[PDB]
Amino acid sequence: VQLVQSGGALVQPGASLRLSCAASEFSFSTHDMHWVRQAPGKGLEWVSGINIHGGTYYPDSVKGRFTISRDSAKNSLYLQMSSLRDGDTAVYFCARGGKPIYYSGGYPSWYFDLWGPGTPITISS
Amino acid sequence: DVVMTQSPGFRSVTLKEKVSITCQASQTIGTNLHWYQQKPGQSPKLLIKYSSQSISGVPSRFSGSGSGTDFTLTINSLEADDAATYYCQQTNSFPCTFGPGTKVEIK
Amino acid sequence: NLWVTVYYGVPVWKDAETTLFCASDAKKHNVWATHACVPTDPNPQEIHLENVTEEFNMWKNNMVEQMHTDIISLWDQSLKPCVKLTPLCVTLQCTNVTNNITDDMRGELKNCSFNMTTELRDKKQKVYSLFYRLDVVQIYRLINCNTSAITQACPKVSFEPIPIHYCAPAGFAILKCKDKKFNGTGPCPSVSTVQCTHGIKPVVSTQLLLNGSLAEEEVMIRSENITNNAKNILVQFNTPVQINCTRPNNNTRKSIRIGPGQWFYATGDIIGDIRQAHCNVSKATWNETLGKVVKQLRKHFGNNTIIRFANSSGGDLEVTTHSFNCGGEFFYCNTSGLFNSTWITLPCRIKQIINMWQRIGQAMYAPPIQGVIRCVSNITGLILTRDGTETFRPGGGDMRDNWRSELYKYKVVKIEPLGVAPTRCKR
Amino acid sequence: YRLINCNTSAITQACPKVSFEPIPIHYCAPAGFAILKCKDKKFNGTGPCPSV
Amino acid sequence: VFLGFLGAAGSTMGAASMTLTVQARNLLSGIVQQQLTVWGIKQLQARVLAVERYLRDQQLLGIWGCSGKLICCTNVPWNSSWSNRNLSEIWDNMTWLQWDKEISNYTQIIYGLLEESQNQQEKNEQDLL
Amino acid sequence: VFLGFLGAAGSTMGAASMTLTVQARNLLSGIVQQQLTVWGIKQLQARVLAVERYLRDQQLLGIWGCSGKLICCTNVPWNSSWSNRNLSEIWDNMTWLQWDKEISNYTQIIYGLLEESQNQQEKNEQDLL
Amino acid sequence: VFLGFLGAAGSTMGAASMTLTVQARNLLSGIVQQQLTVWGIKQLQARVLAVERYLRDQQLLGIWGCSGKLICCTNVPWNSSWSNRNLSEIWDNMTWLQWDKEISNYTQIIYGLLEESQNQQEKNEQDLL
Ligand SMILES: *[C@@H]1O[C@H](CO)[C@@H](O[C@@H]2O[C@H](CO)[C@@H](O[C@@H]3O[C@H](CO)[C@@H](O)[C@H](O[C@H]4O[C@H](CO)[C@@H](O)[C@H](O)[C@@H]4O[C@H]4O[C@H](CO)[C@@H](O)[C@H](O)[C@@H]4O)[C@@H]3O)[C@H](O)[C@H]2NC(C)=O)[C@H](O)[C@H]1NC(C)=O
Ligand SMILES: *[C@@H]1O[C@H](CO)[C@@H](O[C@@H]2O[C@H](CO)[C@@H](O[C@@H]3O[C@H](CO[C@H]4O[C@H](CO)[C@@H](O)[C@H](O)[C@@H]4O)[C@@H](O)[C@H](O[C@H]4O[C@H](CO)[C@@H](O)[C@H](O)[C@@H]4O)[C@@H]3O)[C@H](O)[C@H]2NC(C)=O)[C@H](O)[C@H]1NC(C)=O
Ligand SMILES: *[C@@H]1O[C@H](CO)[C@@H](O[C@@H]2O[C@H](CO)[C@@H](O)[C@H](O)[C@H]2NC(C)=O)[C@H](O)[C@H]1NC(C)=O
Ligand SMILES: *[C@@H]1O[C@H](CO)[C@@H](O[C@@H]2O[C@H](CO)[C@@H](O)[C@H](O)[C@H]2NC(C)=O)[C@H](O)[C@H]1NC(C)=O
Ligand SMILES: *[C@@H]1O[C@H](CO)[C@@H](O[C@@H]2O[C@H](CO)[C@@H](O)[C@H](O)[C@H]2NC(C)=O)[C@H](O)[C@H]1NC(C)=O
Ligand SMILES: *[C@@H]1O[C@H](CO)[C@@H](O[C@@H]2O[C@H](CO)[C@@H](O)[C@H](O)[C@H]2NC(C)=O)[C@H](O)[C@H]1NC(C)=O
Ligand SMILES: *[C@@H]1O[C@H](CO)[C@@H](O[C@@H]2O[C@H](CO)[C@@H](O)[C@H](O)[C@H]2NC(C)=O)[C@H](O)[C@H]1NC(C)=O
Ligand SMILES: *[C@@H]1O[C@H](CO)[C@@H](O[C@@H]2O[C@H](CO)[C@@H](O)[C@H](O)[C@H]2NC(C)=O)[C@H](O)[C@H]1NC(C)=O
Ligand SMILES: *[C@@H]1O[C@H](CO)[C@@H](O[C@@H]2O[C@H](CO)[C@@H](O)[C@H](O)[C@H]2NC(C)=O)[C@H](O)[C@H]1NC(C)=O
Ligand SMILES: *[C@@H]1O[C@H](CO)[C@@H](O[C@@H]2O[C@H](CO)[C@@H](O)[C@H](O)[C@H]2NC(C)=O)[C@H](O)[C@H]1NC(C)=O
Ligand SMILES: *[C@@H]1O[C@H](CO)[C@@H](O[C@@H]2O[C@H](CO)[C@@H](O)[C@H](O)[C@H]2NC(C)=O)[C@H](O)[C@H]1NC(C)=O
Ligand SMILES: *[C@@H]1O[C@H](CO)[C@@H](O[C@@H]2O[C@H](CO)[C@@H](O)[C@H](O)[C@H]2NC(C)=O)[C@H](O)[C@H]1NC(C)=O
Ligand SMILES: *[C@@H]1O[C@H](CO)[C@@H](O[C@@H]2O[C@H](CO)[C@@H](O)[C@H](O)[C@H]2NC(C)=O)[C@H](O)[C@H]1NC(C)=O
Ligand SMILES: *[C@@H]1O[C@H](CO)[C@@H](O)[C@H](O)[C@H]1NC(C)=O
Ligand SMILES: *[C@@H]1O[C@H](CO)[C@@H](O)[C@H](O)[C@H]1NC(C)=O
Ligand SMILES: *[C@@H]1O[C@H](CO)[C@@H](O)[C@H](O)[C@H]1NC(C)=O
Ligand SMILES: *[C@@H]1O[C@H](CO)[C@@H](O)[C@H](O)[C@H]1NC(C)=O
Ligand SMILES: *[C@@H]1O[C@H](CO)[C@@H](O)[C@H](O)[C@H]1NC(C)=O
Ligand SMILES: *[C@@H]1O[C@H](CO)[C@@H](O)[C@H](O)[C@H]1NC(C)=O
Ligand SMILES: *[C@@H]1O[C@H](CO)[C@@H](O)[C@H](O)[C@H]1NC(C)=O
Ligand SMILES: *[C@@H]1O[C@H](CO)[C@@H](O)[C@H](O)[C@H]1NC(C)=O
Ligand SMILES: *[C@@H]1O[C@H](CO)[C@@H](O)[C@H](O)[C@H]1NC(C)=O
Ligand SMILES: *[C@@H]1O[C@H](CO)[C@@H](O)[C@H](O)[C@H]1NC(C)=O
Ligand SMILES: *[C@@H]1O[C@H](CO)[C@@H](O)[C@H](O)[C@H]1NC(C)=O
Ligand SMILES: *[C@@H]1O[C@H](CO)[C@@H](O)[C@H](O)[C@H]1NC(C)=O
Ligand SMILES: *[C@@H]1O[C@H](CO)[C@@H](O)[C@H](O)[C@H]1NC(C)=O
């Protein structure tokens, strides 16, 4: 079981980019999924997430620039980012939300059981 | 926001030592703290959840506890394979946040 | 071809005024200790809401009135079943204390004798006690003797500022505003729903707000109306400042039998030299906080406008001084040395008969306390008024605003789970 | 002389029409509760009671 | 059980409808239900009132023939004067808070028409035996 | 909701049966439910007792397998000793007040026989799987 | 109605299940419900609490889709980790007291899985129209 990820990229400031992950040996339809990013020298900043019912959550640090989506038919996740900055250089990861202690509906537990390998994006001139 | 700090910045330890590091919150987070580890070049792994719960796939030598603003991670007997940077995350209050991490170096 | 469908458990609400219930801290006659709310603790019941921007208004928050209403009720319930000092409303024969008294204490202490009752209703006894001049009137007599009944606070009852948490009753929920730099009113883009509030200490003070919460980033200044000089302005510091208050003059108390099961506590002679009560403020930090306040006041009053701080002019102790309660003693300290600046030792007096909320008297009679008092508090905020260059002075207000300053982040709403919408389904 | 409790506490007079007669009182469970009665002969006050 | 609750309100009515039990499970017990008559009497009064509110809604569902389940089809047609939106428009673009405001004007009318379940019960007896 | 209420009592049982919700809707809220513990305590006591009465009747219907709806068929035969009138005679010429008096003697007997729903539930499980 | 009550506990779960109404009929009225605020206030408090307990269990059954009847099939499979006995072994050789102790560890888990009735209701609407 793993999160299969796309390769990294180099883009110019102001560029848009789409990242993606896929579910190996499980269905994404049964889990809340999140993206985090690790800037060089930093820990994991939560970037976005989508619940099992398609509801979403965003940080104010990316809201309006980043969009999260899911297509359960193909077991794929996407992160679409616009107007990227040099300050957004980071390794991006998908992670499967950890199972909650008691039923919440489409409300995430905010911790993770499964982590992908990491997809770096460099934004520069 | 919940500001999380960790101490020491790094810890210098040797094999078979019983060791520990701690995490603090600027505001109470109840028991909603989770411990993670990461090795260079590797993806993150979750080791302890909800302050003191065990996780399958995590060796029994790892344990910890805490509440409110003060939490501790410990290893009963340090192994070479335990070198990692250890991190705390809180899920008590949105946005979810995390501390800077403590590096554990083994000699 | 649509049909009515009934839905139950719908996540909607409307503003409502209900009673909130307190919760205790577990860990024993400290007031709140008797009127226990039943301990809680593992209750970090906080849920982030997405979108759903909602409005708040701290000056229209009914929770403030409840805090006022129940704390005053509990005050009376705790102190009602005590002694009732009817026998002390008598003529006093007073002289001056001639002991080693400093200049700042001249005229402050009286040595008074009187004819007191005994347990045996045939006889009288000669009793004396020291008194402070603020509670005594020359005709001498106790100053409140001609107005209303006087009691003695129960010696085992301690009104410690224990934090109290509040929770919703079933059918209700509390919305917490997390908006940074919220000024107290209007839309709050970031709201979470909680079961309970954090704890708030029932601190009653004047002018400066002690032991409350601190601002997250900047000093915040807010009021119902910024430009209304008839209103009080609330200032919340992002940095605490310590104030050290002391009461010198090591002393004791005498237990005097006044009736069949009734005892009075008298003030004994002072051990050692006699000095006045006072408070210490670090000048470095006082100067910093006023400068920070001015930088923020200028946002609404002009950054080319000179701002001055001035004295708490008014007609009484409860108006002009800084009220504290430490060790069970009530202090009235002089803050004119703080509000003196255009952009630290504070002498202090004490009293035993405290009206608290005016009303009719109450007169709990703080009993004499043995030994000495040392008390250090955290200055967390300030209340000001403006006179309109502009000048600000320490303000007024009821204890209501010592709640409002913490309560502003929370609002309570009523849940209405049942409603309808069209669907394509017919029974 | 003096009344012996004069120096200690308040004294009252029992109401002359109030009589604390040892009238037997029965107790019953509230709804949601039931009372188990032990019929064990020579029960010594603790432990298992085979007949309830 | 604040594992999840009114956070459903952040989304559309359609999405929110999938988690209705999340709120229902939190309607019967306040802090005073989990746990000198002065002051304490208020806790007693509050518990009683909470019960009354609960029962009044249950009684209404009983009367309408909708007692039990979260979702009840009524066999009462929706009036064209109550709103003018595509069915999918309200379920996918509106929240429950918005919806409740939009049709507030018809609350009593709609409820009055749910009295029709009484006529249905008479018809059912006659053809049931 | 005194738009209509016990006025149903002026007619026959048959006619009255068509308006049963008219009374049901008026059973949970007295004036004190629409709105110094001395005197005021009585209002609290009354509200509590009203709730208890309501629930006891609902519990009885639950036990009988008749919870929900206004009219419940029981599958328990009517005894010939309980009354001797044509079915249409009671429904068209008698009122509910008259009827209640006529068969008052059998109240406990009839209710005791409604315990049969328990046997029906056991049979249903066995043949349901 | 102590004509019969907890005496069912002397036998097996199977046998006891045939008399469930025997206990249900005794859950709403204590002696104080059959019948100076000092002392008397306790009777008022007790009646209120009894009501609250009753309603909480009824609400739970409502949420699970099991409101009404004594026995409710859930469509949630039994876990092999919860017990390891033949179905007939527990029904014929165990009592309810023994059973409750044996599976106490799984109470919250089982109840959490009864939330599935919510998914069933969504599916039912979609295919019902
Ligand atoms: C802001 O917060 C600060 C920090 O909490 C507050 O200041 C603290 O206030 C408490 C209480 O005043 C004080 O604790 C006292 O320390 C003394 C040190 O020896 C203790 O002796 C004293 O205990 C006695 O008094 C209590 C009063 O209720 C009794 O409950 C207690 O049992 C003790 O009394 C017994 O012993 C005496 C012995 O002579 C006997 O006569 C009595 O009858 C009884 O038997 C307290 O523990 C803290 O030290 C203070 N800390 C600081 C820094 O000041 C401050 O007041 C807050 N400000 C506001 C505005 O609320
Ligand atoms: C708080 O407020 C925010 C801000 O508005 C809300 O966020 C929006 O939520 C809506 C509802 O979920 C989002 O709209 C959805 O976007 C999906 C993205 O699909 C993309 O990829 C496909 C790939 O083929 C493209 O075809 C498509 O054009 C997009 O490029 C859509 O797929 C969703 O539609 C689905 O459901 C409808 C239902 O009728 C079907 O008809 C469709 O066929 C499809 O199945 C939908 O459009 C919107 O993008 C969100 N914005 C952001 C920035 O995320 C939050 O929802 C709100 N609160 C909460 C709790 O979420
Ligand atoms: C207050 O007055 C009383 C009464 O005179 C003082 O107590 C007396 O002190 C002298 C000192 O030698 C004793 O001899 C007397 O016996 C004391 N009298 C009583 C009745 O105790 C008391 O010291 C005075 N207090 C102050 C502060 O002046
Ligand atoms: C207690 O009461 C006595 C009695 O009134 C007071 O002493 C009297 O003072 C008057 C003043 O002129 C004298 O004429 C009396 O002869 C005094 N009587 C006695 C018995 O001495 C006494 O002063 C009162 N004591 C106090 C402390 O007030
Ligand atoms: C009790 O007596 C005091 C003393 O005379 C009264 O207060 C005084 O009222 C006059 C009125 O002009 C003021 O000038 C004095 O300054 C007041 N004295 C003080 C110490 O402030 C008081 O009002 C009387 N109370 C009653 C109920 O009569
Ligand atoms: C908090 O800041 C907002 C934004 O400046 C204030 O909102 C304004 O209030 C005045 C009052 O009459 C309105 O005329 C303006 O139109 C409001 N601005 C907007 C953008 O709507 C608000 O009053 C401030 N609240 C406090 C307590 O200071
Ligand atoms: C805030 O205070 C200002 C100042 O008092 C209010 O503005 C005044 O309103 C009265 C109303 O009749 C006018 O006569 C004054 O001329 C106004 N003053 C100025 C400078 O225009 C203001 O309305 C208050 N805000 C609110 C919301 O009432
Ligand atoms: C405020 O600080 C001053 C300075 O330390 C305290 O007064 C000193 O007390 C010591 C005690 O022996 C004396 O030796 C010093 O000479 C005093 N200095 C001055 C300037 O008086 C003062 O008591 C403190 N006040 C409080 C409330 O703590
Ligand atoms: C604190 O003590 C000072 C002592 O000087 C008081 O100062 C007086 O303040 C009033 C205010 O208008 C002036 O008119 C007086 O002339 C001042 N006195 C002197 C000697 O200059 C001050 O008011 C006191 N403040 C409090 C709150 O008690
Ligand atoms: C308020 O500030 C003024 C200005 O510093 C203080 O008055 C000065 O006090 C010093 C003390 O030696 C004198 O040398 C200055 O000449 C005074 N200045 C003036 C203009 O008279 C004043 O005392 C301060 N007030 C308080 C309450 O501290
Ligand atoms: C004023 O508030 C500060 C901030 O909470 C208090 O200082 C902290 O007290 C906690 C208590 O365990 C310590 O762990 C922190 O290290 C303290 N912080 C610092 C910077 O020392 C302070 O004690 C309060 N002061 C008063 C008088 O209440
Ligand atoms: C009331 O007076 C009595 C009589 O003096 C007190 O009881 C006496 O206490 C002494 C103490 O050593 C004993 O030796 C006596 O035997 C006690 N008397 C009797 C009759 O037992 C009593 O304590 C006093 N009460 C109060 C409150 O002072
Ligand atoms: C009633 O009699 C029984 C039987 O003798 C007592 O049970 C014994 O209690 C001791 C207490 O430590 C145990 O060690 C024995 O093992 C118990 N016996 C058995 C058979 O279990 C019981 O304590 C007696 N109770 C009273 C109140 O006397
Ligand atoms: C105490 O001394 C002061 C000094 O002026 C004097 O005015 C006052 O009246 C004296 N009081 C007594 C009771 O002697
Ligand atoms: C209060 O007392 C403490 C004791 O160490 C001291 O450090 C602090 O500076 C004092 N505060 C003031 C305002 O003097
Ligand atoms: C106050 O500071 C702001 C900061 O941008 C400035 O725009 C404004 O003109 C200043 N006002 C005055 C009176 O200098
Ligand atoms: C007061 O003086 C007495 C005299 O012996 C001494 O024992 C006591 O400790 C002193 N109290 C204080 C607070 O200094
Ligand atoms: C809607 O209201 C109109 C008002 O006249 C009415 O005629 C019509 O029958 C009502 N019902 C529906 C389902 O449109
Ligand atoms: C259905 O959606 C279309 C989209 O523009 C709209 O024009 C039409 O009026 C809608 N129907 C209703 C009832 O609103
Ligand atoms: C009915 O519609 C009018 C339209 O403005 C509105 O003002 C009024 O409040 C509405 N009534 C209800 C119950 O919503
Ligand atoms: C009616 O009562 C008689 C009394 O013996 C009984 O035999 C008969 O079975 C009962 N049932 C019916 C439906 O008549
Ligand atoms: C039915 O009605 C006729 C009318 O006279 C009556 O004679 C007969 O006894 C009735 N049956 C019953 C059960 O009363
Ligand atoms: C039973 O029938 C007799 C006949 O006269 C009557 O007196 C008695 O009150 C009846 N019991 C009931 C419950 O109606
Ligand atoms: C029982 O628990 C196990 C634990 O892994 C789970 O895999 C299985 O699906 C559960 N359900 C049943 C009915 O066995
Ligand atoms: C069924 O009963 C037999 C009897 O010995 C037993 O061996 C077998 O393990 C039982 N099955 C279960 C699930 O206990
Ligand atoms: C869970 O099983 C353990 C096994 O010993 C037991 O001690 C514990 O009390 C059980 N928990 C429950 C709820 O029965």
Side-chain angles (χ1 to χ4, degrees), chain F residues 6-75:
Chain F
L6 294 172
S11 190
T12 64
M13 291 191 285
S17 74
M18 290 187 278
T19 57
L20 292 171
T21 60
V22 172
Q23 287 71 254
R25 68 189 182 171
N26 285 286
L27 301 177
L28 272 64
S29 178
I31 199 68
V32 299
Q33 294 173 287
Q34 293 296 112
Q35 291 180 336
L36 298 175
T37 60
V38 175
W39 177 84
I41 190 65
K42 290 181 178 182
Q43 292 179 46
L44 181 60
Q45 291 169 346
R47 292 186 194 96
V48 172
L49 293 171
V51 170
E52 292 178 52
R53 289 193 295 274
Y54 171 73
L55 294 175
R56 287 180 65 179
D57 287 342
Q58 292 297 308
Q59 181 64 357
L60 182 59
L61 290 170
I63 291 167
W64 292 344
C66 293
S67 171
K69 297 184 286 189
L70 300 168
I71 302 172
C72 178
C73 299
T74 64
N75 208 38

Side-chain angles (χ1 to χ4, degrees), chain G residues 77-82:
Chain G
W78 192 265
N79 207 285
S80 67
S81 66
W82 294 345

Side-chain angles (χ1 to χ4, degrees), chain A residues 38 42-46 57-59 93 99-101 107 109-113 115-117, chain B residues 34 36 38 41-46 49-50 55 87 89-91 94-96 98-100:
Chain A
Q38 186 165 33
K42 303 295 184 182
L44 308 178
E45 183 184 359
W46 175 79
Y57 301 83
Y58 299 93
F93 298 84
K99 185 177 180 180
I101 64 173
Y107 188 77
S109 66
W110 303 109
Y111 58 86
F112 303 95
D113 293 316
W115 292 89
Chain B
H34 307 272
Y36 295 80
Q38 186 180 27
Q42 303 299 309
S43 66
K45 180 178 175 179
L46 175 65
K49 62 182 182 180
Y50 295 102
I55 300 175
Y87 301 85
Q89 301 190 344
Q90 69 86 17
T91 59
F94 186 86
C96 63
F98 62 93

Side-chain angles (χ1 to χ4, degrees), chain D residues 36-41 43 47-52:
Chain D
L36 303 180
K37 182 172 74 174
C38 179
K39 294 191 286 191
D40 185 69
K41 293 182 182 179
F43 187 70
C49 180
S51 178
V52 177

Side-chain angles (χ1 to χ4, degrees), chain D residues 6-35:
Chain D
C6 183
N7 67 341
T8 301
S9 66
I11 299 169
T12 191
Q13 180 171 254
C15 289
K17 301 297 186 182
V18 178
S19 178
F20 205 111
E21 182 179 309
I23 296 168
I25 306 299
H26 291 251
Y27 289 85
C28 307
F33 294 86
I35 299 167

Side-chain angles (χ1 to χ4, degrees), chain E residues 51-124:
Chain E
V51 170
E52 292 177 52
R53 289 193 295 274
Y54 171 73
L55 294 175
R56 287 180 65 179
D57 287 342
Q58 292 297 308
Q59 181 64 357
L60 182 59
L61 290 170
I63 291 167
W64 292 344
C66 293
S67 171
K69 297 184 286 189
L70 300 168
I71 302 172
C72 178
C73 299
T74 64
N75 208 38
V76 177
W78 192 265
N79 207 285
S80 67
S81 66
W82 294 345
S83 68
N84 190 33
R85 294 178 183 270
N86 326 67
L87 181 64
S88 66
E89 182 64 24
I90 71 172
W91 286 109
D92 293 309
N93 292 331
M94 295 180 72
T95 68
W96 280 109
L97 291 168
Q98 290 171 319
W99 179 250
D100 188 66
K101 290 179 181 179
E102 185 176 50
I103 60 165
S104 181
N105 284 89
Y106 304 109
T107 300
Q108 294 76 7
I109 293 166
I110 293 168
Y111 294 176
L113 295 171
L114 297 176
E115 289 291 324
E116 289 297 318
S117 290
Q118 182 168 240
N119 288 333
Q120 186 64 51
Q121 290 180 44
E122 176 63 20
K123 289 177 182 178
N124 291 343

Side-chain angles (χ1 to χ4, degrees), chain C residues 195-255:
Chain C
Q195 186 187 43
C196 306
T197 70
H198 66 79
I200 299 171
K201 295 180 181 177
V203 176
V204 179
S205 70
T206 61
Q207 296 183 12
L208 300 174
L209 306 176
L210 305 177
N211 289 23
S213 66
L214 283 301
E216 295 81 3
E217 296 180 357
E218 296 182 0
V219 175
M220 297 296 292
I221 303 175
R222 60 175 68 89
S223 70
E224 183 182 356
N225 186 340
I226 294 297
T227 59
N228 189 332
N229 61 310
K231 300 291 186 173
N232 287 292
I233 300 166
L234 175 65
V235 179
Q236 183 179 33
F237 296 113
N238 63 1
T239 302
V241 177
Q242 294 183 12
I243 182 165
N244 299 21
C245 296
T246 66
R247 198 269 290 147
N249 307 331
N250 170 22
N251 206 338
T252 190
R253 64 188 186 188
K254 305 294 185 181
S255 176

